[PDB]
Amino acid sequence: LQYGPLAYILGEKTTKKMTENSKLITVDGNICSGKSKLAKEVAEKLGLKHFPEAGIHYADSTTGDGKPLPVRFSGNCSLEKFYDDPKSNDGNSYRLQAWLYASRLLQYADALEHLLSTGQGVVLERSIYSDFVFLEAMYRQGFIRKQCVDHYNQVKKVTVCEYLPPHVVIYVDVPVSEVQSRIQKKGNPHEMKITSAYLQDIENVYKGTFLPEMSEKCEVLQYSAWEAEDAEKVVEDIQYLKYDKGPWLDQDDRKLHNLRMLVQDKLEVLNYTSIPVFLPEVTIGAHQSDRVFQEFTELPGRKYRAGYNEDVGDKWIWLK
Amino acid sequence: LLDLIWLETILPKTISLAQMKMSTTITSQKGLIKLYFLSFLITILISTTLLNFHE
Amino acid sequence: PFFDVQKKLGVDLDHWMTIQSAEQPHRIPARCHAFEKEWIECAHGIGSIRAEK
Amino acid sequence: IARTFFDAPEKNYERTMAILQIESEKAELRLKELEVRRLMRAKGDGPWFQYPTIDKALIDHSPKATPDN
Amino acid sequence: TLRWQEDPEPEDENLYEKNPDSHGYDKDPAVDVWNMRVVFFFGFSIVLVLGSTFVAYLPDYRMQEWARREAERLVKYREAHGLPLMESNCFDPSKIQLPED
Amino acid sequence: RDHWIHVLVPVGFVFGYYLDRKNDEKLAAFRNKSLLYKRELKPQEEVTWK
Amino acid sequence: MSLVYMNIMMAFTVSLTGLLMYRSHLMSSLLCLEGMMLSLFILATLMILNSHFTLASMMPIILLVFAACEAALGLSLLVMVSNTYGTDYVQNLNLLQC
Amino acid sequence: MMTGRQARAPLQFLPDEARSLPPPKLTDPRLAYIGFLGYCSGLIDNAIRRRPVLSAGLHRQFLYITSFVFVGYYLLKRQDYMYAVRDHDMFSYIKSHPEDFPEKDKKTYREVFEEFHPVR
Amino acid sequence: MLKYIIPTMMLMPLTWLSKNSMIWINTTLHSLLISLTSLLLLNQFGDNSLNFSLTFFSDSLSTPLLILTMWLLPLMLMASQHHLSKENLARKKLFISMLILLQLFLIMTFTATELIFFYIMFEATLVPTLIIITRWGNQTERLNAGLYFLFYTLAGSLPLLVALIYIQNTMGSLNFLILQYWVQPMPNSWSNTFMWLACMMAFMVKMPLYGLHLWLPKAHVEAPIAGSMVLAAILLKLGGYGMMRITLLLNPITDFMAYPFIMLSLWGMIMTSSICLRQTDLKSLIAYSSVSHMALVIVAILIQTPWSYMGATALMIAHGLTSSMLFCLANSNYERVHSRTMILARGLQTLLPLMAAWWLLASLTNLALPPSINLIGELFVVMSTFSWSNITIILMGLNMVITALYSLYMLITTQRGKHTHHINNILPSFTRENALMSLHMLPLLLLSLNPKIILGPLY
Amino acid sequence: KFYIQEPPHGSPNWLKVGLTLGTSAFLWIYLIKQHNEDVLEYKRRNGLE
Amino acid sequence: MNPIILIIILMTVMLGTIIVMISTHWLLIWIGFEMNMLAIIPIMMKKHNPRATEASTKYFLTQSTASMLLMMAIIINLMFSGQWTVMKLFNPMASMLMTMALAMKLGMAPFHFWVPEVTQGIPLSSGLILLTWQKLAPMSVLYQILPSINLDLILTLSILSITIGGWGGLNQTQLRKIMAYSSIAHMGWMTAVLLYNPTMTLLNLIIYIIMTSTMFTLFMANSTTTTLSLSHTWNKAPIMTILVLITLLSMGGLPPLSGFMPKWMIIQEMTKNDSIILPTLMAITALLNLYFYMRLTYSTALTMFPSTNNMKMKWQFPTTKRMTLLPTMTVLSTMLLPLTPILSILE
Ligand SMILES: CCCCCCCCCCCCCCCCCC(=O)OC[C@H](COP(=O)([O-])OCC[N+](C)(C)C)OC(=O)CCCCCCCCCCCCCCCCC
Ligand SMILES: CCCCCCCCCCCCCCCCCC(=O)OC[C@H](COP(=O)([O-])OCC[N+](C)(C)C)OC(=O)CCCCCCCCCCCCCCCCC
Ligand SMILES: CCCCCCCCCCCCCCCCCC(=O)OC[C@H](COP(=O)(O)OCCN)OC(=O)CCCCCCCCCCCCCCCCC
Ligand SMILES: Nc1ncnc2c1ncn2[C@@H]1O[C@H](COP(=O)(O)O)[C@@H](O)[C@H]1O
């Protein structure tokens, strides 16, 4: 393709284009912690590209024309349906969780590809290292079953071991009552159905399992609600960090070349997300999958490859 | 009696069950190197003396 | 398959150590040089099937 | 119908005769080839089944160190 | 509990509901009519009528007529000169050699 | 032609007939040589059959 | 043939039946491999020195070189094993049975 | 088999005796079939990469069928040479050993005896 | 035979370059044109067979089977375009290509002058049939039906090839024109015994023979309509054609060798007719009737008399047409009631009069009402097997009664009596279905006028 | 412009197209020349002119 | 692994096999075998997981034992002949030892135990490289010593390998074990006809290499390791299901596909030498290989197995893998029957 082993042999090394400013930052927090704009501030002070939080339609925006696909073609889940009745009989909760985790894996792969190809740092929000915490809340409230937890653990174990943790993680500490007040001031009617126990369990699994295990392989920066409103302190603290922990230290050009080889192949990245384990939440039948796939094929710009679609205005097809 | 059981028993089911039993017997090894090399030694012993393959 | 590269390119690689009647160092003869020479000259070009008998 | 589509009986007759001659020749050549292969493997005096032996161009003929050779 | 998320089984489709003049070939009336015309023309007006006419007028199949007519000659030979109608030997006994016994 | 898909089978049949006629000439080692149909050549005729 | 040929062939067969029946230890099998290599070397040089085939004296020593081309390799196939498990037993190498 | 025949002059695709044989025509049916194999390969190459199989990459299909025709023509030349060698060696051995291949009489059916087995 | 292979191969660019919904029309039209041009194979002589080239030749035996195959393809396309209306366009084109490829292999099988080429096409017919059965069937058991259909046939055909190769090392050639003049008598020995078994058991399996017939009730009732047609009307005649070609080399050892298979078929016809008397499925009833008729053809070929050969080929053609019509009737009833039970839909004469007439006519031709060609073939086989022995007529005659005991029964339970009360989706008969049954029956009724074209190569 | 990102095969690779066309033309003319010299030398050897 | 080191190691493997193929000295044969084993060991250690370590250890032990037996037979032939020409041997014991060593190197039964475990413990690239390239040098050495092998020993080894591979292929769900048992059965098929006419052996070797490469490359393209993902492939790309269906139908010895090319002509070489029981038994046993091929086709293409929800995202990303020579290899493995006399170039 564009980057191959012949390119690495011919002289295109990886550490030559990686400066000190090339840092991967994952800004974290609660549901309404206000990080969603705060990370954007860190985008416009350190000169780092900003990636919004990977929703259901991240892959729809990444490929094709960029417009979001209909929900029957991508996701097959609804966040509002989870917010209304989280104990739904069709298993919407774990399906939404699995789709969100796979989209976060795709976003992390894209961010790592951009960082290893351009040398410019990427700012993420709630990466794959801090998604299982949400899952834990879904297990503590009884929203899903133990088999969903087992399947998620299997997928995470077979997927996350081939990647690298971010350089800096920033956690915005907002209490549950302030989170509920911000949710009530948001005005979204589906978000008002969130119980206090769900947010409390999210905070508990953030402070008890994510941060104690995460601070060894990277550097944490825990911030209060008032401190996250001023990005000058955040950028000044980021710019004066002594990076000594994490597996980023013992990386040669060969390891980064192998990582770039694995990352740039998107189907190789998403190979282990759809493991053939039959669970009622994620298993789709033969006829439904056939109908959805045939309806997806006849969409504009999706029948052929990304440059061989005559119905959108691609020319010189017979000479390609 | 005949065309639903016995004719269905003598020809196809006998060889089907025999192939199933032989397939289970062949592939039930424990994956140990020592047993495999012992089988190699026994094969060499059989070929040298009992079958006279060195003549 | 035996892709005979050596005679095709005329390059000698391992034909000197094949027999004991070849070009030995300082013309040192083997203990059975005459017998091997006679056997090779007898069975040259007549085929193995004819040469066995 | 006979003039337009169908063939003459003489045409079919001589076509069948040519087919029979060709196939009989092929069968006789097949039998001769089988006999030739069997005799060549039995004896070994033909160009086939000529297994390699030691080339006599590798033999040294110069006077060696000892005379008894 | 909902094992195997699956589309529901669709109901049967009646071709006479949306088109009472359907011949049963396609739900599109023009395509159905043209398919019906093609089948009835090349199935009855071409391969049956002309085919049976071709089979009926076969030029002396397996020379079944000819073997009669030649026989009509041959008997008129051997009845005229007093010869027997058919000999017991297919081949001439003078040109065949038997092994000694 | 606006109906070019309808001249594939008839052209194939014509091609097969032509190939049959071509193949019949290569099998003419015994043309006017059979013991049953051998005959002197008529005037203005050079082969018995094509 | 002679007598020392019989003894060297008997030594080769002894080391062969030592190798083919493992005793739950990889180093012992590697020692058996080295012993069979040594027996083959000794038999080859005995025949070569008896038959005065001087130009084949390059054969055994070069042969001896390729001994390490597996033997040291065997040691490199052990340390990862001894990093996978605390010991070097051959009964721990049964993960590939399914 | 013919290994000794390929003993004096080895690793030759087509020796000096292969040039006395008539080369295959460019309209050979086997060559056309190999060109069709190349066309099928081009179709599969367009199909497995989500391209329009009858329009995308006409130069690719042309190079496919051209390389297929090239290799098939040379392989057919070698095959014809080898079959000519087989026939020549067989006829030479038949001519060289007349006592091992003696002629047999052709008895007419008026002399030979065949047993008759009735069907009844 | 190059004038028939080339249009058949060109049918695939026709079905792949066609429009979005014009594949059925174009394929039916051009296959009907091929069927029209198929009548040129009737240039038969009283002594000489029609020889085209060194590879293809057509006697008076292969010609009716070729005409039947090229006639059956448009009927097959007409039959299999109702349950595939919901199918994908690519899958529809794949199905049509499968049918075209199967027909191509069938018309290349019958004209092969070399037994190795005939055997190669005879096994090449397995792959499209197996693919059709295992892919476009309806039930689960089709997967099981994909195994019993396959590993039976190869188990008969893999030894036979070896025997054929032995002939290539013995007689010097396998050309059928050469072997008619270079044939030799087969002495009685164990080697010739097992060579006879190798050369025959493939054709006993593919006919089928009683005892080896177990794959046919399974591969007939899970297969779709096109697969049922191709098994019933053509693929069971490959065994008969192979028997008629291979019996020439196996003389005179066949006189004492054919006894156990003759007894097996003579009891298997009674056993399968009795099974037909108690079958709860229409499709299984038609399958077992096919087994009985092919056992009759096995007896006719094995006794090897001219009347037996004539009755065998007439029975083959007549049974192919009648079984195809019966399977299309069963397919129409299955498409209307969505079940295979015989006792479910009763009294259909009060709802479909024309389909009742077609059912009555098909059941009439099934029990060999004279002067149909069914009666011609069955009668001639009866005459020959009475010449063979004077007791076998009993084993014929009783069988005839049982035939008339199930076919009319297959009529009555499906046509007469009080109609069921809880079934109210009985649509009127479509024009396509009636066209299919008329195209199935009118050649069969017309062949009674001139049967001399289906009376074998020794008429 | 339709796609939100530039496809890697949006524009035809002109050097690859030229190399493919040149290779095909060279192979065709080489095969034609080889066949002509082969049939000419065959006619020379057997004298079948 | 560095790409330079990988290229150097692959070139060393090729150089070792070439050295075995082109040398006229037994010591050079053994040197090439040792170089091939030494340069093929780290290819299986590419991903650095324990299963690679077990597979490498078992392969190294088996290959070392085979090389020791080969060198012992070479030394015995030197003792009894006094030369080094790679030709027929002059001691039946040396012939037996060489046949045993080459059977262990080819993985032929009853030395077949290491083949499925080594094939399962290594990635698909190393597995394809092993099962295709490493089965070229021992077949060449067997080709060279043709007037020396005992007929009974090699025929017993062939029928044992065919029966054991056909029986072992039934009870596997992993694809690599299926390919290993198929390779063992094909090994028996090639060594069954070696003493009669080795041109058929070379034809079978070429055909088997083409079909094995096609199946392994399709496994790369679909990124499948087990039967369930191979079943799941119908949602991503149905053309891959069509290709694996026609390929597995080819490897079952079903005409008119190219897998009927070797086996049929193998029978054509056993009846000329008055052996009729053995080809019949061999075809009856190859029916088992056809059986588990049919099971694989039923799981993969002819039935529509259920899929998961996440595959929807895989509908938005086309394959960008380097499927090298895949359409040409599929066409060669499927539609090569009418060019049957092409094998006359192998004489
Ligand atoms: C063949 C194998 C494949 C089978 C499937 C084939 C599918 C394709 C079919 C193609 C078209 C059909 C081909 C076969 C045609 C057979 C018919 C044919 O041509 O026959 C030739 C025969 C030829 O007769 P012939 O041979 O005696 O005459 C000598 C030949 N000619 C004609 C040249 C002088 O035709 C007839 O017999 C027709 C006679 C006249 C028409 C009928 C008159 C009587 C009708 C009934 C009157 C009432 C009776 C009582 C009724 C009471 C109530 C029921
Ligand atoms: C579908 C199920 C039933 C299938 C039945 C298939 C047929 C049954 C018999 C097949 C026998 C094998 C083929 C024989 C071909 C003989 C050709 C020939 O020239 O014979 C003369 C040759 C004669 O030998 P020769 O020709 O080498 O010697 C020269 C001739 N003499 C003897 C005079 C010196 O016969 C043989 O070589 C032996 C024939 C018998 C072989 C016995 C072993 C096979 C046993 C049957 C296995 C069948 C499959 C079982 C499994 C099925 C799947 C589950
Ligand atoms: C009588 C004696 C005859 C001797 C004939 C000798 C012919 C030449 C040698 C053939 C032997 C096999 C050669 C290739 C061995 C396998 C190479 C291999 O595995 O390459 C790995 C490579 C990986 O590609 P990628 O997908 O990017 O990587 C995934 C991450 N590991 O790539 C792959 O995995 C994809 C596959 C690449 C190679 C495919 C084509 C070559 C092999 C099949 C033969 C094709 C027909 C030509 C030869 C005909 C005769 C055999
Ligand atoms: N894995 C998840 N499961 C459920 N909801 C999630 C998950 N990840 C993010 N969300 C929702 O995403 C929103 C947070 O986005 P933001 O408001 O931009 O911080 C809240 O509504 C969360 O409930």
Cα distance between residue K196 and residue K206, in whole Å = 18
CA-nearest of A7, A40, A14 to A235 is A40
Nearest to H17, CA basis, from H70, H108, H86, H73: H86
The CA-atom distances, in angstroms, between I15 and each of A20, E2, H47, I80, I127 are: 63, 42, 18, 15, 20
Tokens of A201: 């369990």
Q: Which residues pair with K307 in a beta bridge?
A: A284
How many Cα atoms sit within 13 Å of B42 on the Cβ side?
Answer: 7
Judge residue E42's burial from the number of C-beta atoms within 10 Å of its C-beta, 0-12 exposed, 13-18 middle, 19 or more buried: buried
Helices (H), chain K: 3-22, 26-44, 50-81, 92-106, 114-121, 124-128, 137-144, 151-168, 175-192, 198-222, 227-236, 238-251, 260-270, 277-300, 311-314, 326-334
SS3 label, residue K307: strand
A173 bridge partner residues = A224
Q: Residue A59 corresponds to which tokens in the numbers above?
A: 């892959």
DSSP-derived secondary structure letter, D58: G
Give the torsion through C-alpha atoms of K301, K307, K313, K319, to 10 deg.
-20
Ligand 4 centroid vs A117 CA: distance in angstroms?
29
- DSSP alpha helix (H) spans, chain H: 29-48, 58-96
Report d(CA I453, CA I436) in Å as an integer. 24
Q: Which atom of ligand 2 is nearest to the CA of I198?
A: 7
State the pairing for strand pair A168-173/A219-224.
parallel
Count of beta carbons in the 10 Å neighbourhood of residue I122: 27
From the CA atom positions of chain H, what is the Rg in Å? 25
| Residue A67 to residue A274: CA distance in whole angstroms | 24
Query: Which amino acid, D33?
Result: E
Number of structural domains in chain K: 1
Cis, bond preceding I252 (omega within 30 deg of 0)? yes
The minimum CA-CA distance between H68 and chain A, rounded to whole Å, is 21
**Sign of the dihedral defined by the CA atoms of residues C42, C46, C49, C53, in that order:** negative
Long-range contacts of B22-28 (CB under 8 A, 24+ apart): B22/K167, B23/K167, B23/K168, B23/K170, B23/K171, B24/K171, B26/K164, B26/K167, B26/K168, B26/K171, B27/K167, B27/K168, B27/K171, B27/K172
Report which residue type is found at J8.
P
Give the separation between CA I405 and CA I274, rounded to whole angstroms: 9
How near does any CA of chain K get to the CA of B9, in Å? 19
Residue bearing tokens 């030395």: K111
- Secondary structure (3-state) at E47: coil
Distance CA I27, CA I39 (A): 19
Where are the extended beta strands (E) located within G1-98? Answer: none
Give the 3-state secondary structure of residue K132. Answer: helix
Backbone angles phi, psi at J44, to 5 degrees: -70, -40
Task: Give the residues surrounding ligand 4 with Cβ less than 6 Å away.
Answer: A 31-32, 36, 53, 97, 100, 131, 134
Contact H110 E99 (CB under 8 A): no
**D35 interfaces chain F, CB cutoff of 8 Å:** no
With both helix axes pointing from N to C terminus, report the angle between I431-446 and E29-44 in degrees, rounded to the nearest 10: 0
Cα(I312)–Cα(I240) distance, integer angstroms: 8
Which DSSP helix (H) or strand (E) runs through I330?
A: helix I306-337
* DSSP category for residue A206: I
How far does the centroid of ligand 3 lie from the alpha carbon of residue C49, in Å?
38
Mutate to test the pocket of ligand 2, among I147, I184, I188, I194 (most ligand atoms within 8 A of CB): I194
Instruction: Please tell me the distance between residue I194's alpha carbon and the centre of ligand 2 in angstroms.
Output: 5
Token reading at A152 = 């998620």
D23 closest CA partner among A27, K144, K284, F27:
F27
Please indicate if any CB of chain K lies within 8 Å of the CB of C12.
no
Reported residue count of chain E is 101
Class of the G1-86 domain?
mainly alpha
D chain contacts of residue E58, beta-carbon cutoff 8 Å:
1
Structural domain harbouring F30: 1-50
What is the number of H-type helices and E-type strands within chain H? 2, 0
A14: Cβ–Cβ under 8 A, 6 or more apart, which residues? Answer: A116, A253, A256, A257, A260
Residues in chain E closer than 8 A to D8 (CB atoms): none
**What does the alpha-carbon distance between residue A273 and residue J18 come to, in Å, rounded to a whole number?**
42
From the CA of A32, the nearest ligand is: 4
What's the distance, Cα to Cα, between the start and end of chain E in Å?
Answer: 95
Specify burial of residue B7 (Cβ count, 10 A radius: 0-12, 13-18, 19+): middle
Instruction: Find, in chain D, the residue whose alpha carbon is nearest to that of F17.
Output: D5
Backbone CA torsion sign across I362, I364, I369, I375: positive
State how far the Cα of I34 lies from the Cα of I20, in Å rounded to an integer.
Answer: 23
Q: For chain A, how many residues are written?
A: 320
Residue I127's Cα: distance from chain center in Å?
A: 17
Residue E54 near chain D (CB below 8 Å):
yes
What 8-state DSSP symbol labels residue D57?
G
Q: Is F42 exposed, middle or buried (0-12, 13-18, 19+ CB in 10 A)?
A: exposed
A301, burial (CB in 10 Å: exposed 0-12, middle 13-18, buried 19+): middle
Is I206 buried (19+), middle (13-18) or exposed (0-12) by CB count in 10 A?
A: buried
- 3 state SS of I53: coil
For residue A92, the ligand closest to its alpha carbon is 4
d(CA K217, CA K322): 10
- Of K255, D19, A250, A66, the closest CA to residue I56 belongs to D19
Tell me if the bond preceding K110 is cis, omega within 30° of 0: yes
Asked if K109 and K76 touch (Cβ cutoff 8 Å), the reply is: no
Alpha-carbon gap, residue D37 to D48, rounded angstroms: 8
Query: B and K: touch, per 3+ CB pairs < 8 A?
Result: yes
* DSSP helix/strand/coil, I425: coil
Cα I290 to Cα A179: distance, rounded to the nearest angstrom: 78
Contact predicate K132/K212, CB 8 Å:
yes
C-alpha span between I280 and K222 (Å, rounded): 46
Phi-psi label, residue E7: left if phi above 0, alpha if psi -120 to 50, beta otherwise: beta
- CA distance readout (Å), K4 to A251, G78, H99, I447, K10: 19, 26, 66, 78, 10
Q: Is E49 helix (H, G, I), strand (E, B) or coil?
A: helix
Residues B43, B47: Cα–Cα separation, whole Å: 6
Pairwise CA distance, residues A60 & A56, whole Å = 9
Judge if the upstream peptide bond of residue K147 is cis by omega within 30 degrees of 0.
no
Q: What are the residue boundaries of the structural domains of chain I, listed by start?
A: 1-459
Kindly report the backbone phi and psi dihedral angles of residue K46, in degrees, each rounded to the nearest multiple of 5, phi listed first: -75, -35
Of the candidates I45, G12, E2, F46, which has an alpha carbon nearest to the alpha carbon of residue K72? Answer: G12
Name the residue among D12, D23, D31 with its Cβ closest to that of I177.
Answer: D23
* Residues H117, I255: C-beta atoms closer than 8 Å: yes
The string of DSSP letters for A157-200 reads HHHGGGS---SEEEEEE--HHHHHHHHHHH--GGGGG--HHHHH
- How far apart CA A70 and CA A76 sit, in angstroms, is 9
Q: What is the DSSP string of A102-143?
A: HHHHHHHHHHHHHHHHH---EEEES-GGGSHHHHHHHHHTTS
Strand partners, A50: A123
**Closest ligand 4 atom number to CA of residue A82:** 4
Amino acid at I43: N
User: Where would I find the H helices in I184-305?
Assistant: 190-206, 216-221, 225-230, 237-246, 254-257, 259-276, 282-303
Provide CB contacts within 8 A for I269, sequence distance 6+. Answer: I210, I292, I295, I296, I395, I399
- Is residue E5 helix, strand or coil? strand
Q: Which amino acid is at I320?
A: G
Q: How many A from CA of I253 to the centre of ligand 2?
A: 16
The C-alpha atoms of residue I221 and residue I140 are separated, in whole angstroms, by 11
I450 CB within 6 A, ligand 1: yes
Q: What technique was this entry resolved by?
A: cryo-EM
Is the Cβ pair K113, B29 closer than 8 Å? yes
| Side-by-side strand order, sheet with A25-28 | A49-50, A122-125, A25-28, A168-173, A219-224
The reply to whether residue A274 touches residue K304, judged by beta carbons under 8 angstroms, is no
- What pairing do the DSSP bridges indicate for beta strands A283-284 and A168-173? unpaired
The position carrying tokens 């070069």 is: G62
Six token digits for residue A85: 């009745």
For I224, the token pair is 């779709």
Which residues numbered 70-99 in E keep a CB inside 8 Å of some CB on H?
A: 95-97, 99
In terms of C-beta density within 10 A (0-12 exposed, 13-18 middle, 19 or more buried), how is residue G42 classed?
middle
CA–chain centroid gap for A21, Å, is 22
Q: Cα K329 from chain centroid?
A: 16
- The DSSP bridge pattern shows strands A49-50 and A25-28 to be unpaired
Contact assessment for residue A172 and residue A225, using Cβ atoms and an 8 Å cutoff:
yes
Pairwise CA distance, residues K158 & I268, whole Å: 42
K220 CA distance to ligand 3 middle (Å): 12
Return the bridge partners of H73, or none.
none
User: Which of helix, strand or coil describes residue A55?
Assistant: coil
Dump the DSSP string for K158-203: HHHHHHHHHHHTTT--BHHHHHHHHHHHHHHHHHHSTTT-HHHHHH
Asked if A260 and A3 count as a contact pair (C-beta separation under 8 A), the reply is yes
> Among residues K86, K95, K196, which one has the least CA distance to residue K141?
K86
Find tokens 């002070």 and name the residue: A45
CB atoms within 10 A of CB A252: 11
- Any atom of ligand 2 within 6 Å of the Cβ of I447: no
